[PDB]
Amino acid sequence: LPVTVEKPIPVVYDLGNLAAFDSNVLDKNDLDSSNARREEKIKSLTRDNVQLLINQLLSLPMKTTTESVGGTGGQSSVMTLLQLPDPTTDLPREKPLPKAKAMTKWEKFAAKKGIKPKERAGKMIYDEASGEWVPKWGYKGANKKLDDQWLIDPRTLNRAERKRLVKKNEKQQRRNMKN
Amino acid sequence: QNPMRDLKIEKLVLNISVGESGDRLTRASKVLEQLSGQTPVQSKARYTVRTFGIRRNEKIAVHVTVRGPKAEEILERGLKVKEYQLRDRNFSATGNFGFGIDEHIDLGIKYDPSIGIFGMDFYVVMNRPGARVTRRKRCKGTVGNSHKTTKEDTVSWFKQKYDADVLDK
Amino acid sequence: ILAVKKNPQSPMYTQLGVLTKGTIIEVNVSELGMVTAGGKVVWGKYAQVTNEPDRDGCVNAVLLV
Amino acid sequence: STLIPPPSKKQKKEAQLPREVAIIPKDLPNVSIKFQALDTGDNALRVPGAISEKQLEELLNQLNGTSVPYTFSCTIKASDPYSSLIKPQITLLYTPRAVFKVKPVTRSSSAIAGHGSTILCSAFAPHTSSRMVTGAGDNTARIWDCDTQTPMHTLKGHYNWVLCVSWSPDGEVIATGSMDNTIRLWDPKSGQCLGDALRGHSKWITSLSWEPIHLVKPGSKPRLASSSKDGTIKIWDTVSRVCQYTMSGHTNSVSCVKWGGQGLLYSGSHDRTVRVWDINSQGRCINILKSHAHWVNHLSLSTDYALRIGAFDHTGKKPSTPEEAQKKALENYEKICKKNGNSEEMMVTASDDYTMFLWNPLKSTKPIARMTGHQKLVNHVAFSPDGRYIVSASFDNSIKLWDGRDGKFISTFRGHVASVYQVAWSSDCRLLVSCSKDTTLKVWDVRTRKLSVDLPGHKDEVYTVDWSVDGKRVCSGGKDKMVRLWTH
Amino acid sequence: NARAKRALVKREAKLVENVKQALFIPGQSCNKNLHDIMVDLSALKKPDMKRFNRKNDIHPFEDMSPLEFFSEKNDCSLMVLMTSSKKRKNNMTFIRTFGYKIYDMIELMVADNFKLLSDFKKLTFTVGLKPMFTFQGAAFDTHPVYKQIKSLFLDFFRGESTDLQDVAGLQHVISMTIQGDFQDGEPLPNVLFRVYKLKSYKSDQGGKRLPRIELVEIGPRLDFKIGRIHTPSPDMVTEAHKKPKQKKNVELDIMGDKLGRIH
Amino acid sequence: IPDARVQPDRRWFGNTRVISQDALQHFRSALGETQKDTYQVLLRRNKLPMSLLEEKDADESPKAR
Amino acid sequence: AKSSAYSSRFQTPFRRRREGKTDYYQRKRLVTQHKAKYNTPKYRLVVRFTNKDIICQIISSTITGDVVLAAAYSHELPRYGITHGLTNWAAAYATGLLIARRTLQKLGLDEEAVEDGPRPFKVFLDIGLQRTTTGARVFGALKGASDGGLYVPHSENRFPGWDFETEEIDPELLRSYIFGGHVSQYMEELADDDEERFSELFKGYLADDIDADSLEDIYTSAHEAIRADPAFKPTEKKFTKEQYAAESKKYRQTKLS
RNA sequence: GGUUGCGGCCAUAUCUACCAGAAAGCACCGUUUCCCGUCCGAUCAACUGUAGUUAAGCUGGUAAGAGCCUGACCGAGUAGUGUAGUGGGUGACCAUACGCGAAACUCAGGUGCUGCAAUCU
RNA sequence: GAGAACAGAAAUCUCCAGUAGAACAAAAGGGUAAAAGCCCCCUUGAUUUUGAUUUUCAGUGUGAAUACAAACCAUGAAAGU
Chains sharing 3 or more CB pairs under 8 A with chain A: C, D, E, F, G
Min distance A132 CA to chain C CA atoms (Å): 17
Vertex B94: Cα angle to B93 and B100 (nearest 5): 80
How far, in Å, CA of E41 to CA of E108, rounded? 13
* CB within 8 Å: E207 and D82: yes
Among chain B residues 52-111, those with CB within 7 Å of any atom of strand I: 52, 54, 60-61, 63, 65, 87, 89-94, 96-102
Which run of H or of E encompasses C41?
strand C41-49
Q: What is chain F's percent helix, strand, coil content, to nearest 5? A: 30, 15, 55
Q: Are E69 and E44 in contact (CB under 8 A)?
A: no
- Strand I–CB B120 distance below 7 A: yes
> What residues does D150 pair with on adjacent strands?
D145
Residue B117 gets the label, from left (phi > 0), alpha (psi -120 to 50) or beta, of beta
d(CA D383, CA D294): 22
Residue by residue, DSSP assigns D265-282 as EEEEETTS-EEEEETTTT
CB atoms within 10 A of CB E35: 15
Q: Residue A115, exposed/middle/buried by CB under 10 A (0-12, 13-18, 19+)?
A: exposed
Give the pairing type, strands E132-136 and A19-21.
Answer: parallel
Report which secondary-structure segment, H or E, holds B8: none
Please measure the distance between the N-terminal and C-terminal CA atoms of chain G and give it in whole angstroms. 28
Q: What angle do CA A64, A68, A69 make, to 5 degrees?
A: 100
G145 Cα distance to chain centroid? 10
Decide: CB of G11 under 7 A of nucleic strand I: yes
Instruction: Report the candidate in G132, G128, G138 with the shortest Cα–Cα distance to residue G23.
Output: G128
Contacts of B151 (CB under 8 A, 6+ apart): B91, B92, B93, B94, B95
* Partner-chain residue, chosen from A1, A46, A93, that has the shortest CB–CB distance to E175: A46
Q: Please name the member of D103, D107, D150 whose beta carbon is closest to the beta carbon of G175.
A: D150
On whether any CB of chain D is under 8 Å from the CB of A72, the answer is no
Q: Are C39 and A71 an interchain contact pair (Cβ–Cβ within 8 Å)?
A: yes
Q: Decide if G122 and A64 are in contact by the 8 Å CB cutoff.
A: no
Are G122 and G153 in contact by the 8 Å Cβ rule? The answer is yes
The H or E element spanning position B75 is helix B68-82
Nearest to C43 among F6, F14, F17 (CB): F17
B42 touches strand I (CB under 7 A): no
Sign of the CA dihedral A87, A89, A91, A93?
positive
C-alpha D177/C-alpha B57 separation (Å) is: 69
**Partner residue opposite C38 with nearest CB, options A72, A119, A121:** A72
Alpha-carbon gap, residue D459 to D361, rounded angstroms:
42
Find, among D432, D431, D477, D433, the residue nearest to D457 by Cα. D477
Question: Is some CB atom of chain G closer than 8 A to the CB atom of E170?
Answer: yes
> Minimal Cα distance from G159: which residue of D?
D110
Residue D380 near residue D256, CB atoms below 8 Å: no
- Position D191, amino acid: G
Q: How far is the CA of E85 from the C1' of H105 (A)?
A: 20
Concatenate the DSSP letters of all residues of chain G into one string: ---HHHHHH-----HHHHTTT--HHHHHHHHT--SSSS----EEEEEEE-SS-EEEEEEEEETTEEEEEEEEEGGGGGGGT--S--SSHHHHHHHHHHHHHHHHHHTT-----TTT------EEEE-TTS---TT-HHHHHHHHHHHTT------GGGSTT--SSSSS--HHHHHHHHTTHHHHHHHHHHHHH-HHHHHHHSHHHHHHT--GGGHHHHHHHHHHHHHH---------SS-HHHHHHHHHTT------
Whether B158 CB is under 7 Å from strand I: no
∠ CA E223-E226-E229, rounded to 5° = 150
Q: Which chains touch D (3 or more CB pairs under 8 A)?
A: A, C, E, F, G
How far apart are the C-alpha atoms of D2 and D19, rounded to whole Å? 29
Rounded distance between C-alpha atoms, residue A76 and residue G71, angstroms = 26
In sequence order, the β-bridge partners of residue D175 are D166, D185
Kindly give the interhelix angle for G215-228 and G89-106, rounded to the nearest 10 degrees: 10
Element (H, E) at C35: strand C34-35
Tell me the Cα Rg of chain D.
24
Dmax over Cα atoms in chain D, in whole Å?
78
**Closest by Cα among G181, G245, G192 to G216:** G181
User: D59 by DSSP, 3-state: which?
Assistant: helix
Instruction: Tell me if residue B154 falls in helix, strand or coil.
Output: helix
- Ramachandran sector of residue D79 (left: φ over 0; alpha: ψ -120 to 50; beta: rest): left
User: Contact G36/A75, CB-based, under 8 Å?
Assistant: yes
E47: preceding bond cis by omega (within 30 degrees): yes
Closest to A126 (Cβ–Cβ): which among F3, F9, F21? F3
Residue D367: CA count within 13 A, CB half-sphere? 17
Question: What is the 3-class SS of D142-209, one letter each residue?
Answer: EEEECCCCEEEEEECCCCCCEEEEEECCCCCCEEEEECCCEEEEECCCCCCECCCCEECCCCCEEEEE
DSSP chain A: -------SSPPEEETTTTEEE------HHHHSTT-TTHHHHHHHHHHHHHHHHHHHHHTS-EE-----TTSSSS--TTPPEEE-----S----SS--GGG----HHHHHHHHTT--PPP---SEEEETTTTEEEESSSTT-TTSSTTT-----HHHHHHHHHHHHHHHHHHHHTTTTT-
Q: What are phi and psi of G95, to 5 degrees?
A: -65, -40
- Give the whole-angstrom CA distance, residue D387 versus residue D391: 11
Of all nucleotides in the shown strands, which has a C1' nearest the CA of G20? Answer: I34
Between residue 122 and residue 151 of chain B, the positions with Cβ below 7 Å from nucleic chain I are: 122-123, 125, 134, 137-138, 140, 142-143, 151
* Residues G183 and G88: beta-carbon distance below 8 Å: yes
Does residue D239 sit in helix, strand or coil? Answer: coil
* b/e D177-206 (16+ beta carbons within 10 angstroms → b): bbbbbbbbbbbbeebebbeebbebbeebbb
**D3 Cα to chain E: minimum distance (Å):** 9
| Whether E186 contacts chain A with CB within 8 A | no
Asked if D229 contacts D253 with a C-beta cutoff of 8 angstroms, the reply is yes
Helix (H, G, I), strand (E, B) or coil at D295: coil
Comparing CA positions, the residue from F33, C39, C31, F26 lying closest to residue D450 is F26
The sheet carrying D141-145 orders its strands as: D119-124, D132-136, D141-145, D150-155
Q: Single out the residue of D371, D341, D337, D367 nearest to residue D354, CA to CA.
A: D371
Distance CA D422, CA D412 (A): 15
Contact A71 C38 (CB under 8 A): yes
* I16 nearest neighbour residue (CA to C1'): B94
First to last CA, chain B: 25
- Inter-chain CB proximity F3 and A65 less than 8 Å: no
**Could you write out the DSSP letters of every residue in G43-68?**
EEEEEEE-SS-EEEEEEEEETTEEEE
Closest-CA residue in chain E for D5? E256
Write out the H or E segment, with its range, that includes residue D46.
strand D45-46
* Structural contact between residues D133 and D167, judged by C-beta atoms closer than 8 angstroms: yes
G4 contacts: CB under 8 Å, gap ≥ 6: none
- CB pair distance less than 8 Å for E254 and F30: yes
DSSP string for D377-419: -EEEEEE-TTSSEEEEEESSS-EEEEETTT--EEEEE---SS-
HEC string for chain E: CCHHHHHHHHHCCCCCCCCCCEEEEEECCCCHHHHHHHHHHHHHHCCCEEECCCCECCCCCCCCHHHHHHHHHCCCCEEEEEECCCCCCCEEEEEEEECCEEEECCEEEECCCCECCCCCCCCCCCCCCCCEEEEECCHHHHCHHHHHHHHHHHHHHCCCCCCEECHHHCCEEEEEEECCCCCCCCCCCCEEEEEEEEEEECCCCCCCCCCEEEEEECCCEEEEEECCCCCCCHHHHHHCCCCCCCCCCEEECCCCCEEEECC
CA distances in angstroms from D176 to A84, D165, D391, G108, listed in the order given? 55, 5, 26, 39
Kindly state the DSSP code that residue D120 receives in the 8-state scheme: E
| E187 CB neighbour count, 10 Å cutoff | 7
Helix (H) or strand (E) holding D122: strand D119-124
DSSP-based helix, strand, coil % in chain D, nearest 5: 5, 40, 55
DSSP state of D300: E
Q: Does residue F46 sit in helix, strand or coil?
A: coil
Pairing status of strand G43-49 against strand G123-126: parallel
Report d(CA E161, CA G38) in Å as an integer: 10
Question: Is F6 in a helix, a strand, or coil?
Answer: coil
Name the nt closest to B120 by C-alpha to C1'.
Answer: I5
- CA angle E138-E139-E143, nearest 5°? 150
CB atoms within 10 A of CB B164: 10
Phi, psi of B94 (to 5 degrees): -95, 10
Residue E17, CA atoms < 13 Å, CB-side half-sphere: 26
Say yes or no: E253 contacts chain F, CB-CB below 8 A: yes
Show residues of chain G in contact with E124, CB under 8 Å: 60, 62, 67, 69
Residue F62's closest chain D neighbor by CA?
A: D375
Distance of CA D97 to the CA centre of its chain: 16
On chain G, the residues whose CB falls within 8 A of the CB of B133 are none
Contact between A69 and G151 using a beta-carbon 8 Å cutoff: yes
**CA neighbor of A42 nearest in space, from E221, E189, G102:** E221
Task: List the E28 CA – H104 C1' distance (angstroms).
Answer: 14
The span from the CA of B109 to the CA of D142, in Å, is: 59
E93 phi/psi in degrees, rounded to 5: -95, 110
* Helices G181-193 and G215-228, axial angle in degrees (round to 10): 150
Q: Hey, what amino acid is at E171?
A: Q
Residues of B in contact with G131 (CB under 8 A): 137
Q: Which residues of D444-466 are buried (b: 16+ CB within 10 A; e: fewer)?
A: bebeeebbbbbbbbbeebbbbbb
Phi, psi of F48 (to 5 degrees): -125, 150
D124: left (phi over 0), alpha (psi -120 to 50) or beta: beta
Instruction: Give the distance from CA G89 to its chain's centroid.
Output: 10
Give dist(CA D264, CA D290) in Å, integer: 17
CA separation for the pair B137, B93 (Å, rounded):
26
CA distance C29 to C48: 14
Contact flag C40-F12 (C-beta cutoff 8 Å): no
Q: For residue G135, which nucleotide's C1' is closest to its Cα?
A: H35
Name every chain D residue with its beta carbon within 8 A of the beta carbon of G111. none
> What's the CA gap between G16 and G1, in Å, rounded?
25
Contacts with G132 (C-beta within 8 Å, 6 or more apart), sequence order = G158
Query: Which chain H nucleotides are covered by protein, judged by CB under 7 A?
Result: 1-2, 4-11, 13-23, 25-31, 33-37, 39-63, 66-73, 76-77, 100-103, 111-121
